[PDB]
Design an enzyme around this catalytic site. Structure first.
Site, PDB file in Angstrom:
ATOM      1  N   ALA C 243       0.814  -1.212   0.000  1.00 34.18           N
ATOM      2  CA  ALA C 243       0.000   0.000   0.000  1.00 34.18           C
ATOM      3  C   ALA C 243       0.848   1.264   0.000  1.00 34.18           C
ATOM      4  CB  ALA C 243      -0.933  -0.003   1.206  1.00 34.18           C
ATOM      5  N   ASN C 244       1.877   1.320   0.848  1.00 32.54           N
ATOM      6  CA  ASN C 244       2.723   2.509   0.881  1.00 32.54           C
ATOM      7  C   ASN C 244       3.426   2.716  -0.450  1.00 32.54           C
ATOM      8  OD1 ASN C 244       1.954   3.132   3.444  1.00 32.54           O
ATOM      9  ND2 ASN C 244       3.870   2.517   4.431  1.00 32.54           N
ATOM     10  N   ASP C 245       3.824   1.625  -1.107  1.00 34.27           N
ATOM     11  CA  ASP C 245       4.455   1.767  -2.413  1.00 34.27           C
ATOM     12  C   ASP C 245       3.522   2.443  -3.409  1.00 34.27           C
ATOM     13  OD1 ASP C 245       6.953   0.592  -1.737  1.00 34.27           O
ATOM     14  OD2 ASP C 245       6.032  -1.397  -1.878  1.00 34.27           O
ATOM     15  N   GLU C 246       2.209   2.295  -3.227  1.00 32.64           N
ATOM     16  CA  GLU C 246       1.220   2.895  -4.112  1.00 32.64           C
ATOM     17  C   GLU C 246       0.575   4.136  -3.505  1.00 32.64           C
ATOM     18  OE1 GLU C 246      -0.897  -0.008  -6.913  1.00 32.64           O
ATOM     19  OE2 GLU C 246      -0.737  -1.198  -5.080  1.00 32.64           O
ATOM     20  N   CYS C 247       1.247   4.766  -2.540  1.00 25.66           N
ATOM     21  CA  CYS C 247       0.893   6.043  -1.924  1.00 25.66           C
ATOM     22  C   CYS C 247      -0.330   5.979  -1.019  1.00 25.66           C
ATOM     23  CB  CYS C 247       0.677   7.136  -2.975  1.00 25.66           C
ATOM     24  SG  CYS C 247       2.093   7.389  -4.051  1.00 25.66           S
TER      25      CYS C 247
END
Lengths: 474, 114, 306
Positions: C243-247
């Site tokens: 999720a963090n990789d996709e903001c």
DNA sequence: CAATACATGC
DNA sequence: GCATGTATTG
DNA sequence: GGCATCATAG
DNA sequence: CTATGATGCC
């Protein structure tokens, strides 16, 4: 295929078999759900005849999917005709379809729907490939993972599914995508959600099954269905074989049909691959490290002829996945998403996905502290001319117009000044640095990623054996 | 207090277990014309001859009709069977099995057949 | 104003004007000890930045991220008033980001539970609500006149300053529309969300099931049993990475917060891997500092002047 | 009825 | 913290 | 007659 | 859900 008897019938698991006649196997699972009225229930039916004595029985068991329920065993003392009658009558009552012509099944509203189920040794090989195959070909571990896919993460409580069942699920996701695309949350949306939850068994406890309202849940469901397909292909591939193998894994290896050769730790290729692994560990994935234990050379038949050698911009990119499903890739190669899958789940479309930063792809391995072994695959991908994307747009594929791949522009990424070469392919060494791409209108992608569409543009080249090393936990 | 002949899946091949006062075979009835309740519930423990291998039979419904029934097998240990039996009796009557002698009909719970 | 800038320089946070106006109010009530002007009457104490207002910090290492930071006060939460030390009842301003004003005043009982209850949008509201609630809790009538007088002063001051006295104001109901999830503390998360819903996604587990997961893990009888039981946390952390990789940073923000609420030391490291990073990804670096320092030194006694 | 869960007070 | 009254579903 | 939308009861 | 039973329909 192999027809298992429900183990829960302890009085008949060892003395009795499911009845079959050619096509028609008298075993069936029905599912129903209606979030409007909050129904979510299953119904399994099985005709069992004892092996030892001539006596037939109908077993029925029902409840909320996931939570084992009320069961009934009706014995007939060999009255096969009556028992088959009862079976067909109940099947009709619960489905409104006749049982004997199960082929032409048509579900009706406010009734149960059907579903479809799966019910002198000279072991000559390098020792390292032997360890690799035994690792990936461990049937026990596959069974254990499948059981975890029912009692750990309740995605498939009752059991497994067929390829065609998954395809019907995808059809329902397509109908959901169409519905949601118009933002209308009225009755048709609820019925479409009912169809989805009917085709793929979920367990919501008691809380009304929720409406599928945003794209995130679409994509999560899509990934779940993909994992289901992956498990299906993994169990299909791990089929054991006779005929004097003296090491059945050698036949399993033939089923891989992909030469995998051990590399020496001191070879240039091994050291450079280790350099690439280490230099490209993203700093924001610091909860663990990774060590390169061993590296294997990949030679997959038929791929050579298919590679788009004519296309420029050839680079080596990562692809990670759980330890168990790799058996499928090495036998069949990477595939584009299924045609029937909804396009809107992939924020930049379908195709094959690669990273150039080891840890970003590596996150898709799901290695563990107890189970510390994972694999990363490196493939040569001819990206050609990339299409540049700043912001999510699931329709990227129409925008290609002559280009051959899409690039999603991430905040952090290596710059070509540090790039090296391996066998005439570009190796994009790190560290990551700022790329000066920014967005004065919306968000900014955290990291680049590259996507190709033609399957012929990928050539797997080395398989990396990686120890994921986790650290202190408190 | 005969073994139910209607338990075709178990008639013929076993003998119900009892112990003096404590008879692990019983039929309970509840009639309540206010709510049109009229239902019975039989419970029977059966022992194997060969091994200590027991089964709990439950059968319930509107009076006269067999309605529904359940077989919980307790080949493991007879004490498990006593646990199921006594616990279920308490659940269904609010009276303990050891104290079954002093039965007091609480509203909406089973009484037995004298 | 000249004594304000040193206060806000110490905390690296801006404080709203009602804080200082309430300081002047309490000064007028009791010049000798304005902070404790309500202590004899209500058993409550002005602390924190009021400690700087009192000049009591001039006795002195001084770590204001921990000053009266109770065991379950999230980094968003800045303690400003203390009550029962038996239950560690306390009131504090709630700020979602170090660059914004508090959205309201919340209360928590750190020895009782982790829930932060809204108590108005300013300290006037918070103290009035506590006062009114205690007025019925007090089993007496003779000893109330003082509370009526002080409450009268509270009401007149709030009217003169133009402050609403409602427990839930208009701005709070507006923030609640921006509140994306309660996260076991009930105060809500505010994360950036663009026109394509990018910025947040929900956890793979329900809140009740998350609490159940925490219970089954913390109650495991051995470290080997925990490691075997740890599988869902590892999975959720991997998906948090996704999720963090996709903001969708708020997801990683939320999970750590729940572990922060759970309170077990077995989760101090994992939360320290999730919550600071999420604040860094959200450009809330001060909250990362606070959570680092608190997880490294999370004590049950937290008055830095002792 | 089973059966599971969720508020239910002392 | 304990058991269970109750509502909800198969 | 026979079957089925439907009850409700357990 | 079993399960009989019910009316009402064909």
């Amino acid at each position: 295929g192999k027809a298992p008897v429900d183990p829960e019938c302890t009085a008949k698991v060892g003395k009795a078999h499911v009845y079959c006649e050619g096509n028609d196997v008298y075993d069936v699972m029905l599912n129903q759900t209606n979030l409007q009225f909050n129904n979510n229930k299953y119904y399994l039916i099985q005709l069992l005849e004892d092996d030892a004595q001539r006596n037939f029985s109908v077993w029925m068991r029902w409840g909320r999917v996931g939570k084992m329920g009320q069961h009934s065993l009706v014995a007939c003392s060999g009255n096969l005709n009556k028992a088959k009658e009862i079976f067909q009558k109940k099947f009709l009552d619960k489905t409104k379809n006749n049982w004997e012509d199960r082929e032409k099944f048509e579900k009706v509203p406010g009734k149960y729907d059907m579903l479809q189920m799966d019910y002198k040794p000279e072991s000559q090989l390098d020792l390292r490939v032997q360890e690799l195959i035994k690792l990936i070909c461990n049937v026990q571990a596959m069974e254990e993972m499948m059981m975890e896919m029912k009692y750990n993460t309740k995605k498939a409580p009752l059991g497994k599914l067929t390829v065609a069942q998954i395809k019907a699920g995808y059809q329902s996701l397509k109908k959901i995508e169409d519905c949601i695309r118009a933002g209308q949350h009225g009755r048709a949306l609820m019925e479409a959600c009912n169809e989805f939850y009917t085709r793929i068994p979920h367990d919501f406890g008691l809380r009304t099954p929720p409406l599928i309202r945003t794209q995130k849940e679409l994509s999560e469901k899509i990934q779940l269905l993909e994992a289901l397909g992956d498990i299906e292909i993994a169990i299909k591939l791990v089929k054991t074989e006779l005929q004097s193998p003296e090491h059945p894994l050698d036949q399993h290896y033939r089923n891989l049909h992909c030469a995998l050769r051990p590399l020496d730790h001191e070879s240039y290729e091994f050291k450079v691959i280790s350099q690439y692994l280490q230099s490209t560990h993203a700093p924001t994935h610091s909860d663990y490290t990774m060590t390169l234990l061993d590296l294997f050379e990949v030679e997959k038949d038929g791929e050579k002829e298919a590679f788009r050698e004519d296309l420029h911009n050839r680079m080596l990119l990562w692809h990670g996945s759980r330890m168990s499903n790799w058996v499928g890739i090495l036998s069949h190669g990477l595939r584009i998403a299924p045609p029937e899958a909804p396009i809107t789940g992939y924020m930049f479309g379908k195709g094959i996905y690669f990273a150039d930063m080891s840890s970003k792809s590596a996150n898709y391995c799901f290695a563990s502290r107890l189970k510390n072994t994972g694999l990363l695959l490196l493939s040569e991908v001819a990206l050609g001319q990339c299409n540049e994307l700043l912001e999510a747009n699931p329709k990227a594929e129409g925008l290609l117009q002559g280009k051959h791949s899409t690039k999603g522009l991430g905040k952090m990424a290596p710059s070509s000044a540090h790039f090296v070469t391996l066998n005439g392919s570009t190796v994009p060494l790190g560290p990551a640095s700022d790329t000066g791409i920014l967005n004065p209108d919306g968000y900014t992608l955290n990291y680049n990623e590259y996507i190709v569409y033609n399957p012929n543009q990928v050539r797997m080249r080395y398989l990396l054996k990686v120890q994921f090393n986790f650290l202190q936990l408190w | 207090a005969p073994v139910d002949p209607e338990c075709t899946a178990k008639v013929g091949k076993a003998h119900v277990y009892c112990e003096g006062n404590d008879v692990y075979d019983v039929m309970l009835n509840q009639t309540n014309l206010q709510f049109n309740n009229n239902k019975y519930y039989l419970i029977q423990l059966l022992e194997d001859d060969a091994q200590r291998n027991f089964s709990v039979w439950m059968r319930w419904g509107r009076v006269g009709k067999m309605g529904q029934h359940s077989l919980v097998a307790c080949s493991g240990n007879l004490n498990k069977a006593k646990e199921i039996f006594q616990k279920k009796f308490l659940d269904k009557t609010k009276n303990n099995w050891e104290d079954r002698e002093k039965f007091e009909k609480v509203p909406g719970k089973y009484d037995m057949l004298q | 104003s000249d004594l304000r800038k040193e206060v806000e320089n110490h905390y690296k946070l801006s404080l709203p004007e009602d804080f200082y106006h309430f300081w002047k109010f309490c000064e007028e009530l009791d010049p000798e000890k304005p902070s404790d002007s309500l202590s004899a009457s209500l058993g409550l104490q002005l602390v924190g930045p009021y400690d700087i207002l009192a000049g009591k910090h001039k006795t002195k290492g001084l770590n204001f991220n921990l000053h009266w930071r109770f065991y379950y006060d999230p980094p968003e939460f800045q303690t400003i008033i203390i009550g029962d030390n038996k239950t560690q009842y306390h009131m504090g301003y709630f700020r979602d980001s170090p660059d914004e004003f508090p959205v309201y005043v919340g209360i928590n009982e750190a020895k009782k539970n982790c829930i932060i209850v809204p108590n108005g949008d300013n300290v006037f509201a918070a103290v009035k609500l506590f006062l009114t609630k205690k007025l019925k809790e007090i089993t007496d009538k003779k000893k109330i006149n003082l509370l009526k007088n002080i409450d009268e002063k509270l009401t007149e001051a709030a009217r003169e300053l133009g402050y609403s006295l409602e427990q839930r104001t208009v701005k709070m109901k507006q923030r609640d529309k921006k509140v994306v999830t309660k996260t076991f503390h009930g105060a809500g998360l505010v994360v950036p969300v663009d026109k394509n819903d990018v910025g947040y996604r929900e956890l793979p587990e329900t809140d009740a099931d998350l609490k159940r997961i925490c219970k089954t893990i913390v109650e495991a009888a051995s470290d080997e049993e925990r490691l075997k039981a740890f599988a869902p946390i590892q999975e959720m952390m991997t998906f948090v990475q996704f999720a963090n990789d996709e903001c969708d940073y708020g997801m990683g923000l939320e999970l750590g917060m729940d572990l922060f609420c759970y309170g077990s030391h077995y989760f101090h490291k994992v939360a320290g891997q999730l919550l600071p990073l999420a604040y860094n990804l959200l450009k809330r670096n001060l909250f990362a500092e606070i959570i680092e320092e608190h997880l490294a030194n999370r004590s049950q006694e937290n008055i830095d002047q002792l």
